[PDB]
Amino acid sequence: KGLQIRVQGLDEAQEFYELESKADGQLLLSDVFRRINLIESDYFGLEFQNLQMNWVWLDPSKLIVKQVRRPMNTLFRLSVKFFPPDPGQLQEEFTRYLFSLQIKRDLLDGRLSCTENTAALLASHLVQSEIGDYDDLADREFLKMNKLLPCQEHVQEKIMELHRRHTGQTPAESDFQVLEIARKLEMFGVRFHPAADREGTKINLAVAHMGLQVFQGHTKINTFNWSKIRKLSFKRKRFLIKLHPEPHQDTLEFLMGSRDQCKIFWKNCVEHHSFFRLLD
């Protein structure tokens, strides 16, 4: 048979895709990339909402019908999968635009936590990009009907104040400022995978362009560069980081919630390493 799949773009606009029932994840990804003419598409992937309404990555090598129960009723969305160290250096204006929309998303849903002043500054550039130069009446109208920050009301004056500085800046220049600000934040591109150490201390694991990170709360306790990592594995609920000597306990153990969570994080790490270090 044939399927009709709904995919939400980074600009929040939903389009519909007609695909055969035999389609892999890769076919849908390719059709989405073609529809929006995304040339630098390797940084991006698709996630969907499972029945507990959590977001899961679409596996491009598996059949879609084997990953999702009601593909016709399921929401998919375009997302950045791999954050490069400096998205401002991406070649295409459209790609940088998509990255600024990813930041916009992360800022609103709280993935990108930062100080209030930094949030306000990011939001002020985001306002410049959508509606142009500062206007008292138009800025208040926009902020009434658009939410950029999780707790925006008491920050709105600061957002507008800062927006007065950006007179004359084009949407592309605005996107660039958003990327330059965001790439310098500790939480940029960060996605937490909760776990506990040997002592039982709650921590968060994450993977990024340089290697693995360890967080306690929102403060980063450690970074293991790819060069320092000998091997990554998982044994049931345990995730294992084997380090190169120098030097005797060369293994860090982290207990995660389920085996499937270990596995998802392991795959994420192997994919990151491959993407940022290996030539296919």
Numbering used by the authors: 49 to 294, 298 to 331
Original paper wording:
FARP1 and FARP2 share a conserved domain architecture, containing a N-terminal 4.1, ezrin, radixin and moesin (FERM) domain, which is followed by a long linker (~200 residues) that connects to a Dbl-homology (DH) domain and two pleckstrin homology (PH) domains. We determined crystal structures of the FERM domains of zebrafish FARP1 (zfFARP1), mouse FARP2 (mFARP2) and zebrafish FARP2 (zfFARP2). As expected from their high degree of sequence identity (>60%), the structures of these FERM domains are very similar to one another, with root mean square deviations within 1.0 Å.
The corresponding site in the FERM domains of FARP1 and FARP2 contains a negatively charged residue (Asp97, Glu100 and Asp107 in zfFARP1, mFARP2 and zfFARP2, respectively), suggesting that it cannot serve as a phosphatidylinositol binding site in these FERM domains. In particular, the FERM domains of FARP1 and FARP2 contain a Lys-Arg-Lys-Arg (KRKR) motif in the loop connecting strands β5 to β6 in the F3 subdomain, which is highly conserved in FARP1/2 from different species. Overall, the surface of these FERM domains show highly polarized surface electrostatic potential, with one side positively charged while the opposite side negatively charged. These packing patterns lead to a linear array of the FERM molecules, which may cause the oligomerization and precipitation of the proteins. The first arginine residue in the KRKR motif (Arg277) in the FERM domain of mFARP2 makes a salt bridge with Asp216 from the neighboring protomer in the linear array. An equivalent salt bridge (Arg284-Asp223) is also present in the structure of the FERM domain of zfFARP2. The linear packing of the FERM domains of mFARP2 and zfFARP2 in our crystal structures suggest a potential mechanism for the oligomerization of these FERM domains. The KRKR motif in the FERM domains responsible for phospholipid binding is buried in the oligomerization interface. We speculate that the oligomerization, if occurs in the cell, could be a mechanism for regulating membrane targeting of FARP1 and FARP2.
